[PDB]
């Protein structure tokens, strides 16, 4: 029997909505953790956390393909996104998931942008995990979301849990609400400037790229992510989207307009993986745009880490598989072909079993949507890769 079956046998029974979320999310998270070879106690801990702090605040059951909100977590507005980080050296993958919790007050004057449940989750986790630090959490929360702060993307905050084989890490995401005088980039920049960083050199590099560079001026910052650790050890990830999709544009953004050098081998491998996962022709000119997709989340997406740990900011690119690839199976086989060609595909069949579990009954080879992004980071001569997965509760109602 699995961990979820044991816990579901013995834990107290839940009301209809909560029990639906338990019997849906429990098996998914447990299957992902099992295919990634997590220790049994970590699976038990993960599902126990899920049972106590996530499931009670997930809101009503899906009952149709119509989502109860326009949540920014996923395109069909599923409030959960899983992610599977590939580790080099035949190491085990890392599993994470992001959740936006909800309450009956969402949209009301008491909580018009659905922030209270995420805050409650962060504080409960702080009660259990003493290593969490809420200094930067509170700072960026007040500055971007609280009283006196300012069009919406559909959410303003969500949280993520990283099961890092032995301990739990928490990430927080702020989605600023834009006004004619306060853009998301404006709010994020002024909050980072008020955050008390030692150095702001990477922030100023990103600011100069976005303001002055011809490619950087095509990027629209929209989201900030932090780690709930000591602020000196946290990352500062600024996410930005562009209508541009050419790989020349992606490479220039990866280099921050040529600021980062000694990345040519990494970017060659990235070009290969990009064509493979999107299903492109191997001879596709890096100057060509991908065929137009007009969506709130189409275009190329990146995040810039401006953590004061370094003076040059680091860039991560997200290949938008759901918008540009032909189908999830083709995209997964492309990613796996790259991984096995570079000796990092020890968990390929496990990843595929996870996809088959998450995928709508008989849609892996006919549609996209399960895999939202393939995230790429340039680590010396190698790539760090992460798959992001959408359970598609509403786009695939069962
Ligand atoms: C909101 C979600 C699920 C992903 C945003 S990108 P990430 O923070 O998961 O990437 P890393 O944790 O830095 O590896
Ligand atoms: N769902 C939003 C926010 C998001 C961005 C990147 C992610 O990895 C996850 C979520 C988007 O696709 O733009």
Swiss-Prot record:
<feature type="binding site">
    <location>
        <position position="388"/>
    </location>
    <ligand>
        <name>(2E)-geranyl diphosphate</name>
    </ligand>
</feature>
<feature type="binding site">
    <location>
        <position position="239"/>
    </location>
    <ligand>
        <name>dimethylallyl diphosphate</name>
    </ligand>
</feature>
<feature type="binding site">
    <location>
        <position position="173"/>
    </location>
    <ligand>
        <name>dimethylallyl diphosphate</name>
    </ligand>
</feature>
<feature type="binding site">
    <location>
        <position position="241"/>
    </location>
    <ligand>
        <name>L-tyrosine</name>
    </ligand>
</feature>
<feature type="binding site">
    <location>
        <position position="373"/>
    </location>
    <ligand>
        <name>L-tyrosine</name>
    </ligand>
</feature>
<dbReference type="GO" id="GO:0009820">
    <property type="term" value="P:alkaloid metabolic process"/>
</dbReference>
<keyword id="KW-0808">Transferase</keyword>
<feature type="binding site">
    <location>
        <position position="72"/>
    </location>
    <ligand>
        <name>L-tryptophan</name>
    </ligand>
</feature>
<feature type="binding site">
    <location>
        <position position="73"/>
    </location>
    <ligand>
        <name>L-tryptophan</name>
    </ligand>
</feature>
<feature type="binding site">
    <location>
        <position position="173"/>
    </location>
    <ligand>
        <name>(2E)-geranyl diphosphate</name>
    </ligand>
</feature>
<dbReference type="GO" id="GO:0016765">
    <property type="term" value="F:transferase activity, transferring alkyl or aryl (other than methyl) groups"/>
</dbReference>
<feature type="binding site">
    <location>
        <position position="239"/>
    </location>
    <ligand>
        <name>(2E)-geranyl diphosphate</name>
    </ligand>
</feature>
<feature type="binding site">
    <location>
        <position position="235"/>
    </location>
    <ligand>
        <name>(2E)-geranyl diphosphate</name>
    </ligand>
</feature>
<feature type="binding site">
    <location>
        <position position="235"/>
    </location>
    <ligand>
        <name>dimethylallyl diphosphate</name>
    </ligand>
</feature>
<dbReference type="InterPro" id="IPR017795">
    <property type="entry name" value="Aro_prenylTrfase_DMATS"/>
</dbReference>
<feature type="binding site">
    <location>
        <position position="373"/>
    </location>
    <ligand>
        <name>L-tryptophan</name>
    </ligand>
</feature>
<feature type="binding site">
    <location>
        <position position="318"/>
    </location>
    <ligand>
        <name>dimethylallyl diphosphate</name>
    </ligand>
</feature>
<protein>
    <recommendedName>
        <fullName>Dimethylallyltryptophan synthase 1</fullName>
        <ecNumber>2.5.1.-</ecNumber>
        <ecNumber>2.5.1.122</ecNumber>
    </recommendedName>
</protein>
<feature type="binding site">
    <location>
        <position position="237"/>
    </location>
    <ligand>
        <name>(2E)-geranyl diphosphate</name>
    </ligand>
</feature>
<feature type="binding site">
    <location>
        <position position="72"/>
    </location>
    <ligand>
        <name>L-tyrosine</name>
    </ligand>
</feature>
<dbReference type="Pfam" id="PF11991">
    <property type="entry name" value="Trp_DMAT"/>
</dbReference>
<dbReference type="InterPro" id="IPR012148">
    <property type="entry name" value="DMATS-type_fun"/>
</dbReference>
<feature type="binding site">
    <location>
        <position position="237"/>
    </location>
    <ligand>
        <name>dimethylallyl diphosphate</name>
    </ligand>
</feature>
<comment type="function">
    <text>Dimethylallyltryptophan synthase; part of the DMATS1 gene cluster that mediates the biosynthesis of a reversely N-prenylated monomeric L-tryptophan (r-N-DMAT). DMATS1 catalyzes the reverse N-prenylation of L-Trp with DMAPP to yield N-dimethylallyl-L-tryptophan. DMATS1 exhibits unusually broad substrate specificity and can utilize geranyl diphosphate (GPP) or L-Tyr as an alternative prenyl donor or acceptor, respectively. Is able to catalyze both forward and reverse prenylation, i.e., at C1 or C3 of DMAPP; and it can catalyze C-N and C-O bond-forming reactions.</text>
</comment>
<feature type="binding site">
    <location>
        <position position="316"/>
    </location>
    <ligand>
        <name>(2E)-geranyl diphosphate</name>
    </ligand>
</feature>
<feature type="binding site">
    <location>
        <position position="241"/>
    </location>
    <ligand>
        <name>L-tryptophan</name>
    </ligand>
</feature>
<feature type="binding site">
    <location>
        <position position="81"/>
    </location>
    <ligand>
        <name>L-tryptophan</name>
    </ligand>
</feature>
<feature type="binding site">
    <location>
        <position position="316"/>
    </location>
    <ligand>
        <name>dimethylallyl diphosphate</name>
    </ligand>
</feature>
<feature type="binding site">
    <location>
        <position position="171"/>
    </location>
    <ligand>
        <name>dimethylallyl diphosphate</name>
    </ligand>
</feature>
<comment type="similarity">
    <text>Belongs to the tryptophan dimethylallyltransferase family.</text>
</comment>
<dbReference type="InterPro" id="IPR033964">
    <property type="entry name" value="Aro_prenylTrfase"/>
</dbReference>
<feature type="binding site">
    <location>
        <position position="318"/>
    </location>
    <ligand>
        <name>(2E)-geranyl diphosphate</name>
    </ligand>
</feature>
<feature type="binding site">
    <location>
        <position position="96"/>
    </location>
    <ligand>
        <name>(2E)-geranyl diphosphate</name>
    </ligand>
</feature>
<feature type="binding site">
    <location>
        <position position="171"/>
    </location>
    <ligand>
        <name>(2E)-geranyl diphosphate</name>
    </ligand>
</feature>
<feature type="binding site">
    <location>
        <position position="96"/>
    </location>
    <ligand>
        <name>dimethylallyl diphosphate</name>
    </ligand>
</feature>
């Amino acid at each position: 029997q699995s961990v979820w079956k044991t816990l579901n046998k013995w834990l107290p029974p839940l009301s209809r909505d909560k029990d639906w979320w338990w019997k849906t999310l429990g098996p998914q998270i447990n299957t992902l953790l099992t295919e990634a070879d997590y220790d049994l106690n970590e699976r038990y801990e993960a599902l126990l956390l899920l049972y106590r702090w996530v499931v009670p605040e997930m809101g009503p059951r899906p009952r149709s393909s119509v989502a109860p909100s326009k949540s920014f977590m996923t395109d069909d507005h599923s409030p959960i996104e899983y992610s599977w980080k590939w580790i080099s050296g035949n190491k085990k993958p890392e599993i994470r998931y992001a959740v936006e919790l909800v309450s009956p007050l969402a949209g009301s004057k008491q909580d018009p942008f659905n922030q209270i449940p995420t805050r409650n989750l962060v504080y409960n986790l702080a009660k259990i995990i003493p290593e969490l630090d809420l200094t930067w959490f509170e700072h960026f929360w007040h500055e971007l979301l609280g009283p006196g702060s300012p069009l919406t993307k559909g959410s303003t905050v969500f949280a993520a849990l990283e099961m890092l084989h032995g301990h739990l890490s928490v990430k927080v995401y702020f989605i600023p609400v834009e006004t004619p005088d306060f853009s998301a980039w404006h709010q994020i920049k002024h909050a980072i400037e008020a955050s008390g960083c030692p150095n702001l050199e990477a922030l100023n590099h990103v600011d100069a790229y976005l303001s002055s560079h011809d490619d950087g001026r095509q990027l629209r910052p929209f989201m900030l992510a932090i780690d709930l650790v000591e602020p000196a050890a946290s990352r500062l990830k600024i996410y930005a989207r562009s209508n541009q999709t050419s790989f020349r544009f992606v490479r220039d953004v990866m280099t921050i307009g040529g600021l980062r050098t000694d990345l040519d081998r990494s970017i060659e491998k990235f070009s290969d993986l990009w064509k493979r996962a999107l299903g492109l022709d191997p001879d596709t000119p890096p100057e060509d745009e991908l065929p137009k997709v007009d969506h709130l989340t189409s275009g190329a997406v990146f995040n810039f880490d401006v953590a004061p740990k370094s003076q040059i900011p680091e860039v991560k690119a997200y290949i938008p598989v759901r918008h540009y690839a032909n189908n999830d199976l083709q995209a997964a086989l492309g990613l796996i072909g790259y991984l096995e060609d570079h000796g990092h595909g020890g968990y390929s069949q496990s990843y595929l079993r996870g996809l088959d579990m998450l995928a709508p009954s008989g849609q892996l080879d006919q549609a996209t949507g399960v895999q939202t992004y393939f995230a790429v980071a340039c680590q010396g001569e190698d790539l760090s890769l992460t798959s992001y997965l959408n359970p598609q509760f509403y786009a695939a109602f069962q």
